[PDB]
Design a binder for this molecule. Sequence first.
Ligand SMILES: Nc1ncnc2c1ncn2[C@@H]1O[C@H](COP(=O)(O)O[C@H]2[C@@H](O)[C@H](n3cnc4c(N)ncnc43)O[C@@H]2COP(=O)(O)OP(=O)(O)OP(=O)(O)O)[C@@H](O)[C@H]1O
Ligand SMILES: Nc1ncnc2c1ncn2[C@@H]1O[C@H](COP(=O)(O)OP(=O)(O)OP(=O)(O)O)[C@@H](O)[C@H]1O
Ligand SMILES: [Mg+2]
Ligand SMILES: [Mg+2]
Ligand SMILES: [Mg+2]
Lengths: 207, 297, 751
Amino acid sequence: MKLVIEGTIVLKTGMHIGGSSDFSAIGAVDSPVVRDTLTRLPLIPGSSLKGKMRYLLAKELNNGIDQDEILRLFGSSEKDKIRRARLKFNDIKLSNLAELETFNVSSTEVKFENTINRKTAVANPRQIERVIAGSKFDFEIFYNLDDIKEVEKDFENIKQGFDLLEFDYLGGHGTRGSGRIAFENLSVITAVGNFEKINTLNEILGA
Amino acid sequence: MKIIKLYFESPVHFGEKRLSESKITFSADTLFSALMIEAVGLGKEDEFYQLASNNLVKFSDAFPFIDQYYYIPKPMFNLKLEKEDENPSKAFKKLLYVPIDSLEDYLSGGLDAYFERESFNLGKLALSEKVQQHDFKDSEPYNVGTFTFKENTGLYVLIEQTHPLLEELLENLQYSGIGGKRNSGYGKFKFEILEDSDIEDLFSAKGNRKILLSGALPKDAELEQALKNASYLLERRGGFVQSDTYATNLVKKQDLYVFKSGSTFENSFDGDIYQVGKKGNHPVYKYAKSFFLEVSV
Amino acid sequence: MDKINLVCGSLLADIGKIIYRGTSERAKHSKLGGDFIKSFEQFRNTELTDCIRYHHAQEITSVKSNKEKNSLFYITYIADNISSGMDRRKDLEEGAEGFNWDKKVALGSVFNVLNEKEKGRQNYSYPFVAEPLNFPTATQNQYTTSYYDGLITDMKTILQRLKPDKEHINSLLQMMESLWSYVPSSTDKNQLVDISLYDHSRTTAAIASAIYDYFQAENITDYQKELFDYNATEFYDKNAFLMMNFDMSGVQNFIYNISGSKALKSLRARSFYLDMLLEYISDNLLEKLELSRANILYVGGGHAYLLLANTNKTKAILSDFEHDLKTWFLDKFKIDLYVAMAYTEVSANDLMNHNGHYRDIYRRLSQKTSAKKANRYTAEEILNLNHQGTENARECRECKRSDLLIEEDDICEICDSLQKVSRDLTRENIFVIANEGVLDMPFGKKMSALSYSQADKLKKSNAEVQIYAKNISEIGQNLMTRIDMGDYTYRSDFHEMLEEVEVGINRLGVLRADVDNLGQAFINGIPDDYLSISRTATFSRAMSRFFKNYLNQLLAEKSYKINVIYAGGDDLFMIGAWQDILDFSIVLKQKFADFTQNKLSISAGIGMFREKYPVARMASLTGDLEDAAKDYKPDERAVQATKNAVTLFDATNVFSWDTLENDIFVKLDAITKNFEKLDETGKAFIYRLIDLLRGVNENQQINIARLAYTLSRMEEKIGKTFAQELYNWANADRKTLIMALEIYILKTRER
Ligand SMILES: Nc1ncnc2c1ncn2[C@@H]1O[C@H](COP(=O)(O)O[C@H]2[C@@H](O)[C@H](n3cnc4c(N)ncnc43)O[C@@H]2COP(=O)(O)OP(=O)(O)OP(=O)(O)O)[C@@H](O)[C@H]1O
Ligand SMILES: Nc1ncnc2c1ncn2[C@@H]1O[C@H](COP(=O)(O)OP(=O)(O)OP(=O)(O)O)[C@@H](O)[C@H]1O
Ligand SMILES: [Mg+2]
Ligand SMILES: [Mg+2]
Ligand SMILES: [Mg+2]
């Protein structure tokens, strides 16, 4: 009755999620990234991934033509149409530290940028802390088997949202080059209960 | 007896009244709400209510544990037998949780006041600045109060006479999270029923003073009996009913005022499961049964 | 014998002291004060004369034959004796033509005796000025006859428009507090002088009032035999007084736990409302008991101490008052705010320290307070709380309560009343308590913050209006009750308040200053030998006046960008410009050290917040930083914490106020002076240093590499004196260097 959707997020162009305002200098990282409160390792908050995936799906399944699919997959509480959830996103911790330490390189980078005035032609050097490319983020998404008929459509939509994220970004100044990601190891295995059609749900994500 | 150890893999939001702050533990009504929601999920909410209302599954709330040191909220002793020495002042005021094996040592005096608080370090509260992105409108910045535990640290729940149905519900509660923003990336844990031996002796003990270990409200019959030489503290247990099949909108529930989980009594009372949602189409329940730890001053 | 006459004669009792030290003949001061009062045509009932001219043992022995029983002047004598405590009982009166009385001494600060077991012995004094507060001075000060004559002239001006009436006793206390606060009760050496005349007279009046009420309730008309004909030891041993323990609980949760968009504008209103609640409840109780404001010992910090009469009628009134107040608070603040009322049966020996355990009064008072704070409610109030529960859809935005909800908005009656008042709270404003108002008050009243101009047209002979004012001038006419609290508001918007700096940071800095071990300074800080009701009251009032009044005056001295939320007592909350918080923390520490003579430690905590950060989260984070400052220890060997520290934007960054803070501020000033004018191009190494020194427990190669680079840098500049002083300060002081450098960066950041 409960499904867990495993998989890995691979950073392709470097990602800057979130803003934690503290410990700024004159040079500084003018915008830092979100980290674990204790281990200080960078992470993708489940809210960020959930919201960006919901954005991509909502703008995809509608195209200016939320719907039942988005509301049943991510929830709803608007005024009367209260739908609870089926997806339960989790915070995604940085998996690649054993690999990233073999390169003698930190998990994050400081990207140097500037904006150039168009009237006075004067630059302005901003620094953006960024999680380096090649970082991997193994995640888990819990799906509740509320209805057994709608599972195929829900998982088709989940795979479609992942695919839309593949041709988009996940956090921060994406259109300026940052935040490209990819997905692999995408498998769903039942955690509680027994779903006989777990094979076609793995084939949905495998495709 | 049957310490249920909860190991969290993500920061939790156990909010008390608002989203911007989180507290470090969840109460027993929160856990019963979560288990009742699970039971509605797999269609046996009636048997769960029968079990909990027939005292077959009665539990305390979630207390911290650090490195196999089971903690308990500072019991509300009258401190009538400590003015001779030590520090009968704000020294024993910042102390929030004491270990449960060293309670008789604390009760009789001799536990260090300063040492415990730095010894008691389980993670820290965190800010989580979020937004609601709007395509053309202004974005809506909000923050969620969260709390991350340490590596060998979590919460533990006291349960008497664990049940197969309760074990089935706790398996389902792993994958639906517990706390505030659980459908976001916050509520997440794994549990172990973890029968224990040095703890069951504390609850097989005897004594005049009883320590309430779960936020409980006495029945109307025994309120007078329980409110005699008692050092208690009330707390409002309200908020919004969390269900999509209740009252077709977002409606609050009747605020309930219960004795806190650190209060001490001379008379043992058995609390009640309280109907706090009546105008809706399913019974919204407030688990307020009593869970005690008898001591002798 | 009327009670008002007793109160007036116990208050205006040592006016002869000032009239003797000032001018005129050198006879005994009681006769001089009696003549001074008799010169006025309205203080003519001969009971004032009996109380003033006859309140010492020798006078009573000299007139006991002429004056019959129930002569009302034994009570003031047996009240002065209790107020004095360990001081003289039978001795030569001031100006008795038998001793060269030192008629030039000023009252010293009570911090001379404070913690004399481990902080030495000193004898400081208060110099005379002309408010404002007088700091203790190392130099010995002497009071001039001109000051005495000024006091006499102002007293004669005020007392002309005064009457011996109930409504004018408050004005009498106001005049005494304004004038006598900085003149001694006794003028001699080889003893203690630090007891002010205001505190002495107020305590004497309170004791006399309680004794009179107790005697009237017990039906005694034999004052001479009970008090003066014998040693009054029977009355001393038996219990006659009570001490109330009004304690407001959960003020922090009522004030800071809010989540409004304009919540920052409301904390001042919440604190003002709570202080008004406490003071109005105390005043209403005093009125119910037919007692003057002299009976109040201390109000502030949600904590009131009142000195009552141990009578069955008084206890019944207290029980009914507690029932009514509990019901009202339940109606308004279900459990989010609650006042605990507990009193202890206290005798005369306990206050006068005959038994040597004067502190047992406060010991059992705290025990009863905690007992009532544990079993707060009966098993009917809880039933009412659980039955007055309704399922709602709307709720208050800040208070998040579904009852007392305004019809048109999701805001609670408290939750919009203390927004209307915050909008209407400005300077030169008074506070009125009438049946029509804006903020609810117990006992069917409401309070408003109307201006002084509308006060005249507001009364219209409405019996009791309870005018409350921040400042009092022309004390005699226009009777008002003076209330003090933190009311420095340079600008009440916090946005144009922040955007007044030109070079700096766009962060909101806050301060939480808490005096360390004040409760211990009361439990055992004051010497047991020097234990008196008057001395304890003097210390309490000095601390409260310090906090409220001197915080206001210190901020008003010059242009500070601070919008103080709460001063009260033992605590401090401030919100303002970040650099203003930083540069006023030092001012606060030095002023506290000067006023308390370096006897009491203080701890603070500063946090940086955005323009829309949750103010409840602001307060909670600043509180846990304050705790991190409270639990500071240089070494983990001694018992208990030093508590003398400040946390600077982080709980782990626990700095001090001692030579450590001296070093950090010297470094900050030196860096500010030196690093303003670089080559403006080589300054890019500053962030390099900051991010490579953020923590030194890791690869050290880059640190020594930057050292080598700094050595390599060679041109015509200041040289390498300070360029190597950076290295010299880069090893011994690691956290100090990073903290001073970050403070310098935030101060000098072009933001
Ligand atoms: N006269 C008198 N007043 C008050 N308490 C008194 C007195 N004599 C004996 N005692 C005993 O002291 C403690 C006080 O504990 P508490 O009741 O918690 O009350 C508060 C506060 O009301 C009171 N206070 C604050 N400001 C004043 C002033 N200006 N004057 C008198 N009293 C005042 O002191 C208590 C403040 O608590 P904390 O701030 O937490 O203490 P701390 O110094 O900060 O400790 P730490 O954190 O630094 O370690 C009772 O036992 C009472 O019987
Ligand atoms: N109007 C006010 N505004 C701001 N602070 C106040 C105000 N009144 C009192 N305070 C301070 O807040 C401090 C904490 O008060 P609070 O009652 O909330 O906690 P407490 O002292 O532990 O009492 P209790 O345990 O009964 O709740 C008090 O010591 C007081 O000095
Ligand atoms: Mg209090
Ligand atoms: Mg204090
Ligand atoms: Mg305090």
